[PDB]
Point group: D2
Amino acid sequence: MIDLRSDTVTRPSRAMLEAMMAAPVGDDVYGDDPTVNALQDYAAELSGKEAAIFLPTGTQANLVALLSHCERGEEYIVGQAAHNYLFEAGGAAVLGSIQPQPIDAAADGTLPLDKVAMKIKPDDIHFARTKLLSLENTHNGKVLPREYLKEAWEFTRKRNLALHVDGARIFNAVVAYGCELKEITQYCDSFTICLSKGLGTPVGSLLVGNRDYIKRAIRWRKMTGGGMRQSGILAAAGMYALKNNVARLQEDHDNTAWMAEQLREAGADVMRQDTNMLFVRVGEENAAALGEYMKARNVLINASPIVRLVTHLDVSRAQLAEVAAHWRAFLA
Amino acid sequence: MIDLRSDTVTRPSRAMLEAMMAAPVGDDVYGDDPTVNALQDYAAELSGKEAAIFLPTGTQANLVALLSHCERGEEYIVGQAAHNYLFEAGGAAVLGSIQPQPIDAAADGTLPLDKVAMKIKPDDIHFARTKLLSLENTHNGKVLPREYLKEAWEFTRKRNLALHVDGARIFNAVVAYGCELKEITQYCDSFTICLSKGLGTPVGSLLVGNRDYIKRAIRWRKMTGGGMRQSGILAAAGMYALKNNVARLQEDHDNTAWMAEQLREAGADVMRQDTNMLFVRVGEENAAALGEYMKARNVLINASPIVRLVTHLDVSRAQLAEVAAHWRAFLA
Amino acid sequence: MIDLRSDTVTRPSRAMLEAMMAAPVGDDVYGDDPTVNALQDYAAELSGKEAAIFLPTGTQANLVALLSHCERGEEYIVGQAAHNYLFEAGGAAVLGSIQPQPIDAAADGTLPLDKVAMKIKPDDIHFARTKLLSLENTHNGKVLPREYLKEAWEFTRKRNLALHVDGARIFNAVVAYGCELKEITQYCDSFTICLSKGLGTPVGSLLVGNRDYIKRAIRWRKMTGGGMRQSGILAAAGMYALKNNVARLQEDHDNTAWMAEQLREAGADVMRQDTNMLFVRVGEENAAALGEYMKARNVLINASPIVRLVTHLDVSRAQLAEVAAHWRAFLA
Amino acid sequence: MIDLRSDTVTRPSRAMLEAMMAAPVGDDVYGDDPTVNALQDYAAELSGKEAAIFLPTGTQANLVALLSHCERGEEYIVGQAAHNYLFEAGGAAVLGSIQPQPIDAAADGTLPLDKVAMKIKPDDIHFARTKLLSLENTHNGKVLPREYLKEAWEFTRKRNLALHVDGARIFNAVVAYGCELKEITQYCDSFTICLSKGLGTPVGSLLVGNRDYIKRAIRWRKMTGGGMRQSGILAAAGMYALKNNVARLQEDHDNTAWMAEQLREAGADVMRQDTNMLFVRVGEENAAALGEYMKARNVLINASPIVRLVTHLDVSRAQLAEVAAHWRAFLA
Ligand SMILES: Cc1ncc(COP(=O)(O)O)c(CN[C@H](C(=O)O)[C@@H](C)O)c1O
Ligand SMILES: Cc1ncc(COP(=O)(O)O)c(CN[C@H](C(=O)O)[C@@H](C)O)c1O
Ligand SMILES: Cc1ncc(COP(=O)(O)O)c(CNCC(=O)O)c1O
Ligand SMILES: Cc1ncc(COP(=O)(O)O)c(CNCC(=O)O)c1O
Ligand SMILES: [Cl-]
Ligand SMILES: [Mg+2]
Ligand SMILES: [Mg+2]
Ligand SMILES: [Mg+2]
Ligand SMILES: [Mg+2]
Ligand SMILES: [Mg+2]
Ligand SMILES: [Mg+2]
């Protein structure tokens, strides 16, 4: 089975499973789970932050981050296509009583600061109270320019606004920058880390930030339903992932870069390629046809006019070759 | 005094006050105020709708309108600069648990239906549930083209979306169209009518729609705090205004077109004139100074880079001539 | 028409109407309404508080007070039968994301402090965060003992909790205590005043408290839809009420005390009498019969097994005699 | 170590861990995890319901259950000491916009139906809309009488209310009843099953109900953050527990009855013993001291005036004998 629908489908390696089954555990609600604590301390330390908290999903990581930053009536400036505005079902507004102020991202994935500036509300009773700027790195595989990350950080300080980064795929960006995680997380107040995508974990995400901030985050995690018990079994996998699966993300990137060239030399229309993502304009007509045609040969893609292919540790290059052949044969 | 800050500054005429002091009243919570009932029946009949509800303000009329249309987790497509998104402190999301989905309006004030369609969410757990399209007529004085109004209605019927129109200045649109109110309200499920701006009432707005919709609105009005007692005294002004203050809106319109030419003559940079509003680019270097200079001559404006001047029954052409002379002196 | 359903049905006297029609007004949103400001300053001054804000209803006065005191996730201890828990449709929870912790009041109308104490939550992530204690004076005509008001005040300071008093009928209690308003409002951080009940106003209520508190209240009043324009027309009536209708509440009380004795000597079962309220156990059977039987002779009561009769300025004693006759005749 | 803090402290048996490491997984968001699907199908079939949904915690299971049953402005009748009212940080109201209506449970843990009926709100705009009755089985170890369960169900059908049962320890009730699960679940619309307490799972709870109800729950799970990926590894433990850890709950029960007698012998004041819980009145003068003394001997308890001791598969009778000896030494 060749699954290119997303990097969320990565399954645990035997080594990861072993680390999981041998991890000492405790009751996380009581703060007695050794492995959970260890994962959190390690993440805080690696990012230059004071604390971190483990969550069941990146969606809850963001929901909690937003609740922790914004009180009732406050607002967050975010992307119209950002995950914590568009793909978390309006959670920040629906459950958190937070006003979202979405704006279109530039082609490079950043939120134009001149545009963010026009959305910062005056301190007048007619408006929501602007409090947070939220970013997303990577954004649809897009690695945000580092100069912008720094400028966004400077700008938010000037405007007394906090800055959050949805880092579901932050390690993909890190590998692509060729720098240390800390050199990019210094430009935010808080950020998330998904362990269940390219890092290969079964479940789990982390929210990282200032001690006091994280303390509030614990309150919100409890209310939203993410305060688990012996979650050390899951956190164990995250530690294994962070110590063994970061560098090979480069293989996912090289594989995507390779596949783009393949599909290219196969009649396919590759719109763009970034880190572990490739976007192909298949078109309305062949969209559903291609979907079934692939699934028939154990190749899974989220069929659509513009298909998003995502590489990861459970897809090898030979497997990409075979999918490339099938795609080159489909065009007949 | 000469007030061009907004049309909300209108004060009761002598005739309106008499109607008020002479109106029969009752407890509106019990549904026993003859004047509120009469006002609501008249507005309903005048617009071709089943029912109407009187509220303390247009803000509450919209908040209640949004709550009546969208249940928790649902979403409304609306303008980035629309009043019930930008100027009501994010009430729909904060208090209502509704996801707002703003988009930029086109220059004529409409929300391009191609963009609205791009925002309708698929029925998938990752998204909010698109339920309503909210419009604004007039929008900063701009009158929406009638063809678009019919187009939006048809568009929403086809896509099973409700259509709400914030009609704070809908009679300014009606007068400008040269048609009957009902000829434009047939293109919406619900709409609001502000009585306290150009129509000259001291307080009050109305929400109009079908009987079932309004019955839900009544519950939301109570909860949000608009369930008043002897509001008949306030409703009486509304009735006086709808019967005696609608046609004269043409005077305000003529006065704004006139003032626009007077200022153009004076050297001011008039950006645009639409119904009872005209926009002047004063610029940052003169913003505050113009505000003080005018305030000195007993002319009140909302100083700002781009000054919005609003006309109404409490500002005459002669007074506008004086303002144009002061402005003229200011520039040179 | 003899209306005993509530004191909310009081209509404006000619003098009140005159004060209303002659009051100088402004735009309250801009803070330019002279009469609104005057009503607020006078109320703050009379109660020893720093500021006050005028609202369309007592319901919005409480909704706003609760929002101003409690942030998302905080909690207020209140009565199971208190108006801002039971009769405002769950507004504090529904719109404000505030957890209500209701408890049964004692027979005297107070919230037993030993009981309030057991409901104050530990600072643990499993619980809502206790922040406010809310009272109600009068509570179903019941005048709360002054010693308790003082003890409740002392207790909340010891527990670092704010204290709010729903004073819809605070002047009835004031008259019954025979003291100055300030001697009872010193035992709370904020309180409300309804002008539209025994005080005789058509619409309106006031929220009073600390400057900073009230400033937040202005934000919430705007969002909830209570920020009106020329509301000086309404506030004028409140000033007239506060300067002319406070002392005669004693007449309502004497009238209630008189009627109790009458209905008593008529076969009626008077359960209790407090200030301007009388409660009669009519029973399931005669409940609906009595309702229609009265309405037939222009006597309006909220028919029920236990009828609540409320006296006020629009009911004279002769009128109570006539209703007493009808009730004594109904028992045949 | 000897942990009597709660049954949530249970750690995976050797057999459970093997089942976990050997379970086939998939992406649960896509509905492709065979083990989650199997767990959900098994629970549904075992309880006579149409569907089930796996969640990270019982808190989320209840939050989602409440959201699925009550729309905004609706209300649930629930116990003042019930977990989804008292111990979930007011989530239903704070995040869900649902009015909670708590009432004291009777000594046997049921909510007296006469009191529940007194709380059903009339259909009037002043009230929240009563929608759900929530129950707790077991409640602090107390098993609800089966006659009451049938009585509540019948009561809610007659009054058109849905019935939810928080079944964190429902198998403790089942074992105590000596009947099949389905014989008690027929008396509710929905119920939860906690897998991480007495059943010995590291994490996880289940919400069970009809297909339509569960489909709405799936949306709320996503929004609140419980939409995990390869949760099959966690679901596998749940399946192992339901098939191998239910009958032994009787051992925990016997151990608690035994420990209660051991402590009575030692001079402790045993308030009550119900299933796997026993309550000891330690008193304020000895609360903290007992906590330290025990913690010294490697026995963990939740020190407090009234200490709640909870038994489970990780505490044997021999260990309970040691605790009884330490306690005995403590007292004299
Ligand atoms: C299009 C529109 N809709 C709704 C409202 C709310 O009505 P209110 O709550 O009674 O004020 C206004 C108010 N117009 C003001 C104005 O243009 O002067 C603006 C500052 O809020 C408005 O222009
Ligand atoms: C009756 C009941 N319902 C729901 C829950 C929520 O389940 P969780 O979110 O997985 O913890 C608990 C937890 N029981 C804990 C206990 O008894 O030790 C209590 C502190 O929260 C419970 O006892
Ligand atoms: C940028 C981003 N942020 C947050 C999340 C939330 O994570 P959970 O799905 O674990 O809740 C995702 C999920 N990613 C979906 C995909 O790209 O396939 C994501 O891509
Ligand atoms: C104690 C109390 N508090 C607040 C309110 C809210 O006021 P509005 O109705 O103006 O929103 C009322 C209304 N009183 C209802 C009655 O006794 O008839 C009340 O009695
Ligand atoms: Cl809803
Ligand atoms: Mg994975
Ligand atoms: Mg909300
Ligand atoms: Mg006006
Ligand atoms: Mg009145
Ligand atoms: Mg809420
Ligand atoms: Mg466990």
